[PDB]
Amino acid sequence: MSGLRPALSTFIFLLLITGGVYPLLTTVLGQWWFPWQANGSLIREGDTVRGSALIGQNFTGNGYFHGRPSATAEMPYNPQASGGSNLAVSNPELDKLIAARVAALRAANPDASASVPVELVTASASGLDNNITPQAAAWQIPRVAKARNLSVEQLTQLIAKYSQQPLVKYIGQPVVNIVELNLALDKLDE
Amino acid sequence: MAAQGFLLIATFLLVLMVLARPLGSGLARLINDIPLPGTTGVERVLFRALGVSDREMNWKQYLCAILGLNMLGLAVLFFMLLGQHYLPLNPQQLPGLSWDLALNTAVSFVTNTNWQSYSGETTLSYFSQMAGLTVQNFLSAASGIAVIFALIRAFTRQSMSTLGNAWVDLLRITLWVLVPVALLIALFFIQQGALQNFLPYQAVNTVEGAQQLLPMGPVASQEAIKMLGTNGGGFFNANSSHPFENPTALTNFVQMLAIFLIPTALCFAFGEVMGDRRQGRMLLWAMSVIFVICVGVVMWAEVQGNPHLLALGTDSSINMEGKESRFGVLVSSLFAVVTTAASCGAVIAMHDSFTALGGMVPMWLMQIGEVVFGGVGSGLYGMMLFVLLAVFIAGLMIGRTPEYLGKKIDVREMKLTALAILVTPTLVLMGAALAMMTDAGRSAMLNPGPHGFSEVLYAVSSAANNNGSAFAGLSANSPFWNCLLAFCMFVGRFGVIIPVMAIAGSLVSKKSQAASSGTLPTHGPLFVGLLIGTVLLVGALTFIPALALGPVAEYLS
Amino acid sequence: MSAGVITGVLLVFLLLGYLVYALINAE
Amino acid sequence: FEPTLVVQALKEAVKKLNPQAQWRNPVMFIVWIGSLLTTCISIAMASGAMPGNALFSAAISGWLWITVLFANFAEALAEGRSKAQANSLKGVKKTAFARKLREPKYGAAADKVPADQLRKGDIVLVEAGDIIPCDGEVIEGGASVDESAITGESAPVIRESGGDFASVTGGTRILSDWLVIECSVNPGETFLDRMIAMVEGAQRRKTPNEIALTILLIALTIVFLLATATLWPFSAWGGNAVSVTVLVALLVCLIPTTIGGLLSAIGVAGMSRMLGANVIATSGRAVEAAGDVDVLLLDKTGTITLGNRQASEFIPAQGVDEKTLADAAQLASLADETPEGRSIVILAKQRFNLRERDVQSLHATFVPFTAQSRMSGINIDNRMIRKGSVDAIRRHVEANGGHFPTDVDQKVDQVARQGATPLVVVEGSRVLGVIALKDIVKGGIKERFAQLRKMGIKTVMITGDNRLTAAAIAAEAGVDDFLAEATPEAKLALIRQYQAEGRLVAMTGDGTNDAPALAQADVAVAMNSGTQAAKEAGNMVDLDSNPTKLIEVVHIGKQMLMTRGSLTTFSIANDVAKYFAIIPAAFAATYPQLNALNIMCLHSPDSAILSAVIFNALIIVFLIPLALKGVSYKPLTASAMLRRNLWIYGLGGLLVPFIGIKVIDLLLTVCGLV
């Protein structure tokens, strides 16, 4: 056999363990302990799934907090693609897209500052970013306030209540869950 | 900004050594053939059941065992991917893969490279992702740790011919190092919000109304071994940018810790098994100095960012494009350097969207042979080759015979060390030459000018140096690209594993002497600087013209 | 890939093979 | 420095060294192929090729030929220095090797015979002012032979038959009386004739260190060739591809042409330095293995200090009269030949002169004293007056009626505490006490032993005495360890024990009893006073009879290894400045933004590439004297030597290429060639 029995036995045992025990044990442990996290963190309207709490959706309305741009295939914020823009720093195509995004954000927000935050004009790494910085949220305050007839202090309180902070200030960034924020706006309106 | 980055580096490299010292002692116990406490009876029963009992094979049989296991896993994975339509657990009814893509991803997962030219969520099924990819990540990590176990055993063994049992080493590594830490990491991932379901793809009624389909699957089981074994093959098209894989900055920090956990613990294990911790301290000091320099350079480059942002009108010029907003540009820079120096390949930010000088350093960090905490054992034996080169240079420069930890490094060891050093620059230069003068190689462009050649060079460097990180603007799904990268990954793993095992076979037959007054110590800042200079000179003198036509030309443009 | 490219590739491959043979058999 | 009388002919030898002799050195063959293809490219380019300005390609081809000529000049010049030394010392026997005998004891009928075919067994008698035909040893007689034509000094040296100074060499004619010479070996295959034959019939004989360094240079050549050949497909798509001649110029400037062309020159020049230090060695492998030795085997007599013991001491013991002790001593010593012994007994004579002691050897026989016998007993009338060592006296009076009181043990303990050589000579079973022999340990030895003990050099010596006096002498001298009770099998056991630990052994033997040690020693030298049985059974021999120069032998071997490592580091470190001179200049049209990398602000790209090639060619001719002489060697520890070398050859190798390229570019700009 030229010592093929230990080779086949080791490969079969390691295949069986690391493909039918470790994923299976982790699956049963996760679904037993944290099933909401393990099942996609789906936000539901009772029966209607409004979207995951981590994915982020394409928001284009005036009364909705617009997230970062997405370069996923066949539509923005497509979860089936999940591929961000791979344009170089010296790319005229990227320069034209950033110019168009800056012009669109400046036209959509006349009451805000002339300088637009970086996250609103630069595409994310995966095209599925549910998070924006509170600085960009504060920049997007006046348009949503004028659209929804809601006060600036109420919008700031809602944003701070739906803002997540890390364990320390330097391993990440403060973030704003835009899907949950827009759902909170819809629930506040009705 | 700079203070926050320095604090991030300091806490990362503090918690790394804190978590790596006891794992270092454990890996030293597995090197010294002493079973872990409370596990010897089950180990003996399992070995008697499997027929993998004590054989104590030499370097040739160890190498044949590793290659036989890897080729058998390659055949099983290739046939599993070619025939995934008939296999169960396929809720999306995804069709079988093409031959070129299937062979490319089979070689990529076998050779611990994990290059992904496909989109995972629309290409691979739940059964494929859960079984074949996960077991091949486990097997590649176990094979790397087994080869470096053989090298450390060769360094610690005197006047012998055997190198332990390869099957015993593989089973011990997989069952007592890889699996339980992967369980802990995966359950922390479910704590933070990853996926570990087998539910079908979920349709979403969007708030505005644009219906989107959410991909599900066993994400965390693949993610934990991907970070632990420094594999890099993500569930989706985004390796770690996707929120179902890396949802939190704490999760990202845990992923970075898992990436550097095994090479640092193996350096500690090597230092403890030799009986002198100063050697492992030397290795960690050199790797940490190079790592901190690279991290600081990439952080400065990305904080400088795109100069056109203020010209077109933006709040700041930081290159946040192609980066998730859950992580800063500092954290994205740190993750890029960690996963590119460590031969991991996972990305939380697309490296193509990086600046020219910011993506310059990942290219050089792959091209130096992946010696800065590279792989799991691949980086440790690559740094062992560089250490052999450095002690040869030091022995000539002081006029003594070239020796390292007592063993005299002879002509055969120099020949095999030279060949193992020669394999991967030859591979990346030959593959880039082949892909830079063919229509199929030049038609996968996304960016023009020097950055397209930078894309080609990054792809071939990640293939040859077993990294698998991608700019992802390259359309590498072509049959020519798949075959070229599969050849590059195969030779880059198994033209480097073979001469390291031959070096181990040359090392066992010799005898180590003691430390005399005239014996140059292989530790301390002088030898740390000599090793760093050797690594920098060797990795630069091959690739300064290539980087000069690529990222340097793009930066100066 | 004209005749100049073919003869350049041939010369470089011959030099690489000669150097590899010299490294393998260096007396 | 530069002897023109050999430069003018070895330049022609270099001109004849170009075709097909560059194949052995791989770096030299790569630069030769590059020079030939660039010359062919320039020749076709000046006639019928599309790109213009073939004068630049012709200048590149000329300088690429000049650097090959310079490396061959280095190798040939060092080899010719070795050949010149061999031809200078080969004149020891050139004409009229026609001396023989008829009777092996004292023959007649001396005529002319060819002595080049004589097997071992012939006896040759040489008269005054006649050249010795072949090597051998004296059997009867003894004379003051000269060795001026073979060694450095022109002072005659005496010879004796039946003693340790029994060795002759076919060199300077003897300026003394008759002396018979027994033929050791047939002429031609002796040590000296063999080394002249292997220098004239030159064999490369690559040492393992040279092979490993060559493998490193081949690996560097492979990565540089790949990185240079891959530049054309890289730069063809990004604009206009770089010319082939610029690529070959960069490839030559990149590969370690310096150490690659100076490796053989360094090896044969280190061998030449060995022949210049009055040491003749078989192999450069043995020369380098002399470097990096752990133990350093010597003896207490001669190597440390010759001693010349001068001490006449008395005893407060049970012996009646020290006058009678001196009477017995002078009865024993009537025809003493050993220098220390005759000095001791003449000090005893001036202490108390003896009447009627008029060399009475008529009724007394003489027993010679050797290292194996250690006995010199003299029978005067019916007694056996003793002269042997303490172990020999214990051995022979332990048989017949002898016994030892403890008083002689405290006496030799006091002698060991003072520090001397204890002689316990007696008459018979009656104990006559001890005579202390104080030896001087003078000379500049402790400083060199202290500077050598930093180098990983154990300095164990074989005293040939008891374990107490040897310990005291070793402690005051400063050596690491010592060996007492000298015996050839004990020396073999110690050498094999040290070699079983992986430690090299350096030693020195003269007589035929040391021949197994000369055989199974890692490195070992033998002086001219030794016999053929030790000269042909050892790695190394000493032309001058001085066994204290193996320390500079070790120094020269370490100089060879440090020169190889330093020039390898220099060749590796030059490539940074080669990049900074060529890479911003090579892509002056494909990527015009790369001129910011020109940190030396050179004039034009072609001038920059040409200046880099001129520097790469001229660095070998500037490093001729360093390769021929050796590095500036100092006795430091390993870390200090490493950091000093990394400073000098490793900061100069990063700095002075920038200055050299800048100066050559400025000179070209001033001359207006470009």
Ligand SMILES: CCCCCCCCCCCCCCCCCC(=O)OC[C@H](COP(=O)([O-])OCC(O)COP(=O)([O-])OC[C@@H](COC(=O)CCCCCCCCCCCCCCCCC)OC(=O)CCCCCCCCCCCCCCCCC)OC(=O)CCCCCCCCCCCCCCCCC
């Ligand atoms: C710019 C140029 C490039 C520069 C790059 C510089 C490179 C940086 C990394 C350095 C690489 C070191 C390589 C060796 C491995 C070290 C492991 C080891 O053996 O350690 C002992 C070893 C020396 O001891 P030894 O006597 O030689 O060893 C004998 C025994 O074998 C061991 O003796 P021991 O048992 O006493 O060992 C200590 C013990 C300690 O026990 C434990 O802590 C573990 C057990 C308890 C578990 C629970 C504790 C929880 C955490 C501990 C903290 C306390 C609570 C505080 C709360 C905060 C954290 C939660 O256990 C450990 O081994 C754990 C390791 C912890 C210390 C080493 C940390 C290394 C990096 C530190 C910061 C990195 C700076 C990066 C920034 C650089 C930029 C310039 O340490 C070193 O080698 C020195 C490393 C320290 C780095 C200083 C210089 C770096 C540059 C200066 C920057 C400022 C630094 C601090 C910044 C902080 C913010 C202001």
Ligand SMILES: CCCCCCCCCCCCCCCCCC(=O)OC[C@H](COP(=O)([O-])OCC(O)COP(=O)([O-])OC[C@@H](COC(=O)CCCCCCCCCCCCCCCCC)OC(=O)CCCCCCCCCCCCCCCCC)OC(=O)CCCCCCCCCCCCCCCCC
């Ligand atoms: C290239 C041109 C120039 C090169 C020549 C320069 C070399 C010598 C420089 C100075 C010598 C002059 C004489 C003065 C006396 C000694 C002065 C001294 O302390 O210097 C330390 C040392 C030499 O002294 P030593 O002989 O070791 O004995 C004195 C030691 O104190 C005894 O050591 P120990 O074992 O007893 O430990 C004592 C302790 C304390 O003693 C000290 O070192 C003094 C105080 C320092 C801090 C206090 C301790 C705190 C502990 C944390 C350490 C802080 C460092 C954190 C930041 C890192 C900065 C990068 O050491 C420590 O620092 C403890 C931690 C142990 C490892 C730390 C490693 C840190 C990185 C240092 C080197 C990395 C350089 C990167 C770049 C290299 C080139 C690219 O110098 C160096 O650090 C050497 C750096 C450069 C080495 C050569 C570079 C070669 C590059 C070219 C390669 C060749 C071409 C390629 C060929 C092959 C290709 C095919």
Ligand SMILES: Nc1ncnc2c1ncn2[C@@H]1O[C@H](COP(=O)(O)OP(=O)(O)OP(=O)(O)O)[C@@H](O)[C@H]1O
């Ligand atoms: N003429 C002699 N007759 C007898 N014994 C002697 C005579 N000369 C010296 N000895 C003794 O013989 C021993 C030899 O010691 P010594 O150091 O002189 O050795 P060696 O034969 O000259 O050579 P080496 O020093 O190389 O071993 C000493 O004990 C010395 O006192």
Ligand SMILES: [K+]
């Ligand atoms: K990888």
Ligand SMILES: [K+]
């Ligand atoms: K990857």
Ligand SMILES: [K+]
């Ligand atoms: K490597």
Ligand SMILES: [K+]
């Ligand atoms: K390399």
Ligand SMILES: [K+]
């Ligand atoms: K790897």
Ligand SMILES: [K+]
């Ligand atoms: K590798």
Ligand SMILES: [K+]
């Ligand atoms: K190399």
